[model samples]
Target: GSHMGIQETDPLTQLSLPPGFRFYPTDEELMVQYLCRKAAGYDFSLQLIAEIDLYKFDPWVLPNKALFGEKEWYFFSPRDPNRVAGSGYWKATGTDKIISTEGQRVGIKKALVFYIGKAPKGTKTNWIMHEYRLIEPSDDWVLCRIYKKQ
Candidate 1:
């Protein structure tokens, strides 16, 4: 029987990564590599738009807006009009009604930077959401290390 109430199931456990690649990111590593990249060159502190649990839906699909929010953050939803459909990525921003799609790897960096800031130690169980100015939607990925208050 199908779990009718469930929006989606865990795709991570069932899916496979490309050759010589791994999915899990350590808490400390996430803080340094992902979060720090987001916090690097910002003045005003970022706001906590949302904290999405991957267990809720397939990372490849859009999240429920009613449950989350229409603007700001959204879980990768297959139903998202901005989504690449069969592709694994998320639309980070929209320009004049046109949504821009960032590849999966790009999305991870975006998400990390969006929520970058000091997180309480040991609270690295779930993924965090963040916000940042979108400049030239496509550019070389910037990496940095910095700690800031959330």
Candidate 2:
């Protein structure tokens, strides 16, 4: 019995996708569908987005752990006060943007940049990460999107 057994573990093979279609969800979608469910601990069938200790590794190493993304990776990671990773750290640029759904404010989005080497004298890279968190009491899971700034 040499039948081709397709495992339902990986999202890439498990889910059906149209050709040329990308999994890039909007910020509002991130707040409404993904991040909110994640923060509330909902059981989702399709686990395309991964949960990682993001700051523990650099942005370069993060893409490897991604589930379905190619150039841009989406993950749900915990926030740290230090915001340091591997040989560099993520520095927040600009203020946190409020994500509103219809008339209600849902979540907050923060943009951060990965800098190589130490703080203050670190070299800025093209890697940019956007973090999204629900605006309840905070302190839990936060959705992240890390991509190269082309």
Candidate 3:
């Protein structure tokens, strides 16, 4: 009776994940499914994901600012600089992947690591950000999936 005695207010609680279901989404999926839908003026039921200038703050302070994420977080942030105000910069770790659908290129996905000092000499943290943006138009919007490396 330790836990079974307690009843859940909502039956479909977010506690359990479905079979083979993961919070993970590939670059193409992010571009085609979420980003493109957003750019095309469509709306999502989960309006919980917030839009913010993610580069303005450090990653550690992100959870309090995010709506979706526990070990990982998702956000529809303005595609901007890698520098955070008085914090540091997000250093690109070199490998960039292009997002494509049906052999047609759609967007770009970049991997970045957060650092707390000047370039070539900074203390890197476990924070990682997957920045995805549409190269299709003048849309300066990006869907970022931020998470800690554990």
TM-score of each: 0.20, 0.86, 0.76
Could you give the C-alpha RMSD of every candidate to the true structure, in order shown?
16.8, 3.2, 6.0
Across 1-150, the per-residue lDDT of candidate 1 in tens digits comes to: 966685653333334435555434443344344434444632211121123333343222333422222222332111112222122222343222211233222223333311212222112213233322223343122221112224
Ranking by lDDT: 2, 3, 1
Q: Candidate 3 overall Cα lDDT vs. reference?
A: 0.75
Q: Give the TM-score (vs. native) of candidate 3.
A: 0.76
Winner on lDDT (1 vs 2):
2
Task: Give the number of the best model, judged by TM-score.
Answer: 2
What is the per-residue lDDT of model 3 for residues 63-109, given as tens digits with 9 covering 90 to 100?
87775555888888876544653477888887898888999989898
lDDT score at residue 94, model 2, on the 0-100 scale: 78
Number of clashes recorded per candidate: 10, 0, 0
Identify the candidate with maximal lDDT.
2
**Model 1, CA-based lDDT:** 0.29
**Top-down TM-score ranking:** 2, 3, 1
For TM-score, candidate 1 versus 3, the one ahead is 3
Q: How close is candidate 1 to the true structure, as a TM-score?
A: 0.20
